[PDB]
Design a protein around this nucleic acid. Structure first.
Ligand SMILES: [Mg+2]
Ligand SMILES: [Mg+2]
Ligand SMILES: [Mg+2]
Ligand SMILES: [Mg+2]
Ligand SMILES: [Mg+2]
Ligand SMILES: [Mg+2]
Ligand SMILES: [Mg+2]
Ligand SMILES: [Mg+2]
Ligand SMILES: [Mg+2]
Ligand SMILES: [Mg+2]
Ligand SMILES: [Mg+2]
Ligand SMILES: [Mg+2]
Ligand SMILES: [Mg+2]
Ligand SMILES: [Mg+2]
Ligand SMILES: [Mg+2]
Ligand SMILES: [Mg+2]
Ligand SMILES: [Mg+2]
Ligand SMILES: [Mg+2]
Ligand SMILES: [Mg+2]
Ligand SMILES: [Mg+2]
Ligand SMILES: [Mg+2]
Ligand SMILES: [Mg+2]
Ligand SMILES: [Mg+2]
Ligand SMILES: [Mg+2]
Ligand SMILES: [Mg+2]
Ligand SMILES: [Mg+2]
Ligand SMILES: [Mg+2]
Ligand SMILES: [Mg+2]
Ligand SMILES: [Mg+2]
Ligand SMILES: [Mg+2]
Ligand SMILES: [Mg+2]
Ligand SMILES: [Mg+2]
Ligand SMILES: [Mg+2]
Ligand SMILES: [Mg+2]
Ligand SMILES: [Mg+2]
Ligand SMILES: [Mg+2]
Ligand SMILES: [Mg+2]
Ligand SMILES: [Mg+2]
Ligand SMILES: [Mg+2]
Ligand SMILES: [Mg+2]
Ligand SMILES: [Mg+2]
Ligand SMILES: [Mg+2]
Ligand SMILES: [Mg+2]
Ligand SMILES: [Mg+2]
Ligand SMILES: [Mg+2]
Ligand SMILES: [Mg+2]
Ligand SMILES: [Mg+2]
Ligand SMILES: [Mg+2]
Ligand SMILES: [Mg+2]
Ligand SMILES: [Mg+2]
Ligand SMILES: [Mg+2]
Ligand SMILES: [Mg+2]
Ligand SMILES: [Mg+2]
Ligand SMILES: [Mg+2]
Ligand SMILES: [Mg+2]
Ligand SMILES: [Mg+2]
Ligand SMILES: [Mg+2]
Ligand SMILES: [Mg+2]
Ligand SMILES: [Mg+2]
Ligand SMILES: [Mg+2]
Ligand SMILES: [Mg+2]
Ligand SMILES: [Mg+2]
Ligand SMILES: [Mg+2]
Ligand SMILES: [Mg+2]
Ligand SMILES: [Mg+2]
Ligand SMILES: [Mg+2]
Ligand SMILES: [Mg+2]
Ligand SMILES: [Mg+2]
Ligand SMILES: [Mg+2]
Ligand SMILES: [Mg+2]
Ligand SMILES: [Mg+2]
Ligand SMILES: [Mg+2]
Ligand SMILES: [Mg+2]
Ligand SMILES: [Mg+2]
Ligand SMILES: [Mg+2]
Lengths: 77, 46, 62, 95, 102
RNA sequence: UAAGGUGAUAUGAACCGUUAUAACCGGCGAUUUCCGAAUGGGGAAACCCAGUGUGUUUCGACACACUAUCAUUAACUGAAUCCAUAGGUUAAUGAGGCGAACCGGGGGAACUGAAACAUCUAAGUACCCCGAGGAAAAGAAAUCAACCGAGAUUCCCCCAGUAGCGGCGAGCGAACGGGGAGCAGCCCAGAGCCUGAAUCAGUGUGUGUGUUAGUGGAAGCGUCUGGAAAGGCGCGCGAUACAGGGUGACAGCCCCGUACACAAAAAUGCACAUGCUGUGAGCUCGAUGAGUAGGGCGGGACACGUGGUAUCCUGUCUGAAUAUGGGGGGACCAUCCUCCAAGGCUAAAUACUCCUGACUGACCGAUAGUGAACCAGUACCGUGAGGGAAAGGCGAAAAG
RNA sequence: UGCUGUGAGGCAUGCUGGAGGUAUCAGAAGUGCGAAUGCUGACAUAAGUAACGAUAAAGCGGGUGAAAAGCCCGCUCGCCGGAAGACCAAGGGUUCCUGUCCAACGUUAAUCGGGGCAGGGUGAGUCGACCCCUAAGGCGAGGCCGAAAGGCGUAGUCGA
């Protein structure tokens, strides 16, 4: 599925309200990307599927922390 | 003339037989509904 | 019975079991030939069997 | 094989004209046996219990008839028939 | 806890036999009893050759409701009602009027 | 518990028993073929074919046990590639499926209404999907109020069809405040002191209490009518029992019962007691949840349809302050008041009945009442999903 | 059947029935039927009418029997014969064979039957299925994908 492995962002739903306000079902997808990150302590490249948001958060926290929360939540990376 | 039901056993059982139902979500819901109405036989079996 | 059988060893309970088996085979062989007057016997033996078996189990069980 | 199983195989003598015919002419007896028993076990069981020599055991399965009792539709149980060939050697009798 | 039993002498309260006395043969599950010389019916029997049973009208004894029969007190000569007490450790029956055991 | 029994249609045969190994009722046990999550492989369900390891046995084969996946932990193994990881094998622990309604989350209509119809409505309903418990959810203020104050949530009655929202149409619809049901508060984001010291969980034992079989349990006769009395007429008696049912018509006193008074070898529900092991009290000093708050853009939730629209949620792009601080007080600003977000647990009052027991009804009485008083989800109809009937009454007794 | 009320109605009573009914004043209503091409059951009507399923065809003697155009036996006649014959697969599931019965069933009678009731009947190393092997196609460990359910597919494992 399209799910951010970091922030847990998922597809959500909403509408097109047109100019005449005709409401129509739609979705908002997370913005997702398959990316290789450098883990120094493991000396290795982990590949996560993450949103832009996720990436930014990886910059802030460091990747060690993030992966610690991936083993904690118990989801495989 | 040639009518609509031309029977076959292997056909009958692959299409509606027990295992065929159990294969899927929907089928097990059929078998749920039947067990709930309390039929004598659920599926077509010999 | 069943106090009586309880005081016998496992071997003896296996010889009785084999004997009851013969007797029950014989009895239904009679009944099958329509020569059996008392049908009252079948039930007698058919149940005794169970008694024996139910002991064997608890002697192995504990 | 175990003997305990054996004594559980053979239900009953089958009585009929065909039966009598084979018993007289071809030296063969006819048995109702447990639905699950096999040619091995029937060979064993006759040879053991009647203590006579079996040549070969042929079998078939009889589907019970369908009956009506008071409008109700029942089904008579299945069962298994065994033609049991004895060698010309033994003579089994009715007293 | 069963009040009327086999072999009790009873007297009949109700029916064509009202006032008659007799001896109980047996009881049935439905609360019916069958009493000696009591409640004769004339029954027709189709002759049965297997049992060598001739035909004819057999007088037989037909079950009577156990509410209708009372346990006969021989002491008082009256119908009685029955009760239970514990004598020794055993459960026993007695007559209500003279409170004597049976 | 017992003098009767071996379920029914349903006789009989053959028997078992009568003072307690007949039967019957309950407690714990034993057995529990095959199919089915189905789990050794497969499969047209109730079948087909095995492997490994023990164990015999005259050595013909037989018996018995283990062998699913997936998650987690361990152990051993182990490429590309040196370490390493991936990977591979064994082992222990758990999960899978079913089920009525209620519950929280993920999706989510149209008919209809608007006397047409698109916003709106229907309605976050039907339905689908996931997850859970006997309840769940919610829950200890970055809450409201109004210069006086209240003090978590849930639920009921008001406030009020008001304030408002709305093609200002159709409609939708609060809150503040008040009366009640119920009431309970806690921990982590850390050190020191005194340490098993509150609580809570596990387990034994004791008594008490409920449940699962049971025991006793009042007092009535005569006479007419009649097939039969319980009915009429006469004289009685019981009542902490005149609930109700049955018996040849309509019985307090014939039978079962009913009020009342009792009982558990064993298993279980709740209580304190007490022992136990695991869980840590209290105090002092600290500390105080960041890609977060807010913002831009797009939607949604708030009664509140972007409106002058606060307030919450977030797909997207961003982005602070840290008690010399921040949030809210219906655009917004200043003053005044109040509150501390971005961490988590929590009983009760509330909703429901597949199911067990008891009691009741100005509910029905066989075309009614459940589709189903009867062997009914049966016959029968349909390839299938599914549809889906008809059918009660001899009599007191079969004396049929 | 008789009587009585302005009316829906009421009272009394002969037969039938064989155990429940209910004054009075109140109370609550699944409260009143001829229609709805109303719904269920029952019985009419046309009418003892149309019809009795291939225009291949019957006739006689005897038997059985309550009763024979139809059943069994015999004799002639006639029809099919690349089928109206014989053997399978499919599909059915006892219809097979014997005895016995004639209510219903059989478009008539039926003594007959594919009807009723009871019994018997299906014997495999070499014929099939199973089994070994795969086709299309299916399921599919890991894996890729997807709001959830799920979709696709690798090693496999099924599928004549
Ligand atoms: Mg819409
Ligand atoms: Mg042979
Ligand atoms: Mg064979
Ligand atoms: Mg059967
Ligand atoms: Mg298996
Ligand atoms: Mg296989
Ligand atoms: Mg399998
Ligand atoms: Mg290497
Ligand atoms: Mg579950
Ligand atoms: Mg449910
Ligand atoms: Mg929901
Ligand atoms: Mg939603
Ligand atoms: Mg619309
Ligand atoms: Mg409209
Ligand atoms: Mg929802
Ligand atoms: Mg909760
Ligand atoms: Mg203040
Ligand atoms: Mg209040
Ligand atoms: Mg009693
Ligand atoms: Mg009493
Ligand atoms: Mg009467
Ligand atoms: Mg304790
Ligand atoms: Mg910071
Ligand atoms: Mg924001
Ligand atoms: Mg933001
Ligand atoms: Mg701008
Ligand atoms: Mg916005
Ligand atoms: Mg507007
Ligand atoms: Mg405005
Ligand atoms: Mg805020
Ligand atoms: Mg503000
Ligand atoms: Mg303001
Ligand atoms: Mg804070
Ligand atoms: Mg907090
Ligand atoms: Mg009626
Ligand atoms: Mg009905
Ligand atoms: Mg009727
Ligand atoms: Mg069908
Ligand atoms: Mg009469
Ligand atoms: Mg009369
Ligand atoms: Mg009346
Ligand atoms: Mg009135
Ligand atoms: Mg009406
Ligand atoms: Mg009418
Ligand atoms: Mg009219
Ligand atoms: Mg018409
Ligand atoms: Mg009728
Ligand atoms: Mg007509
Ligand atoms: Mg006519
Ligand atoms: Mg005419
Ligand atoms: Mg004419
Ligand atoms: Mg015509
Ligand atoms: Mg004509
Ligand atoms: Mg014809
Ligand atoms: Mg003739
Ligand atoms: Mg003739
Ligand atoms: Mg003819
Ligand atoms: Mg001829
Ligand atoms: Mg030709
Ligand atoms: Mg075909
Ligand atoms: Mg076949
Ligand atoms: Mg038949
Ligand atoms: Mg024939
Ligand atoms: Mg015949
Ligand atoms: Mg006829
Ligand atoms: Mg005729
Ligand atoms: Mg005739
Ligand atoms: Mg026939
Ligand atoms: Mg072959
Ligand atoms: Mg393939
Ligand atoms: Mg998978
Ligand atoms: Mg696939
Ligand atoms: Mg294969
Ligand atoms: Mg196959
Ligand atoms: Mg083939």
């Amino acid at each position: 599925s399209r799910v951010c492995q970091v922030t847990g962002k998922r597809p959500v739903t909403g509408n097109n309200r047109s100019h005449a306000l005709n409401a129509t079902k739609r979705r908002f997808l997370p913005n997702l990307h398959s990316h290789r990150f450098w883990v120094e302590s493991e000396k290795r490249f982990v590949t996560l599927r993450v949103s832009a948001k996720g990436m930014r958060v990886i910059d802030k926290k460091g990747i060690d922390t993030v992966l610690a929360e991936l083993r904690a939540r118990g989801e495989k990376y | 003339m040639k009518r609509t039901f031309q029977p076959s056993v292997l056909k009958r059982n692959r299409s509606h037989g027990f295992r065929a139902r159990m294969a899927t979500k929907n089928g097990r819901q059929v078998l749920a509904r039947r067990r709930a109405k309390g039929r004598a036989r659920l599926t077509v079996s010999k | 019975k069943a106090k009586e059988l309880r005081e016998k060893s496992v071997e003896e309970l296996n010889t009785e079991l084999l004997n009851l088996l013969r007797e029950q085979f014989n009895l239904r062989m009679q009944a099958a030939s329509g020569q059996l007057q008392q049908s009252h016997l079948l039930k007698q033996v058919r149940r005794d069997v169970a008694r024996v078996k139910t002991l064997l189990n608890e002697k192995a069980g504990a | 094989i175990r003997e305990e199983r054996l004594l559980k195989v053979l239900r009953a003598p089958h009585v009929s004209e065909k039966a009598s015919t084979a018993m007289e002419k071809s030296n063969t007896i006819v048995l109702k046996v447990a639905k699950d028993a096999t040619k091995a076990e029937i060979k064993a069981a006759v040879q053991k219990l009647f203590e006579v020599e079996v040549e070969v055991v042929n079998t078939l399965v009889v589907k019970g008839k369908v009956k009506r009792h008071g409008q109700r539709i029942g089904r008579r149980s299945d069962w298994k028939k065994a033609y049991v060939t004895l060698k010309e050697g033994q003579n089994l009798d009715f007293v | 806890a069963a009040k009327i039993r086999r072999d009790d002498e009873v007297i009949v309260l109700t029916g064509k036999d009202k006032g008659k006395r007799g001896k109980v043969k047996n009881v049935l599950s439905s609360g019916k009893v069958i009493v000696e010389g009591i409640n004769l019916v004339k029954k027709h029997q189709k002759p049965v050759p297997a049992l060598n049973q001739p035909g004819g009208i057999v007088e037989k004894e037909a079950a009577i409701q156990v509410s209708n029969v009372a346990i006969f007190n021989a002491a008082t000569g009256k119908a009685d009602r029955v009760g239970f007490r514990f004598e020794d450790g055993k459960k026993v029956r007695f007559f209500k009027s003279n409170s004597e055991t049976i």
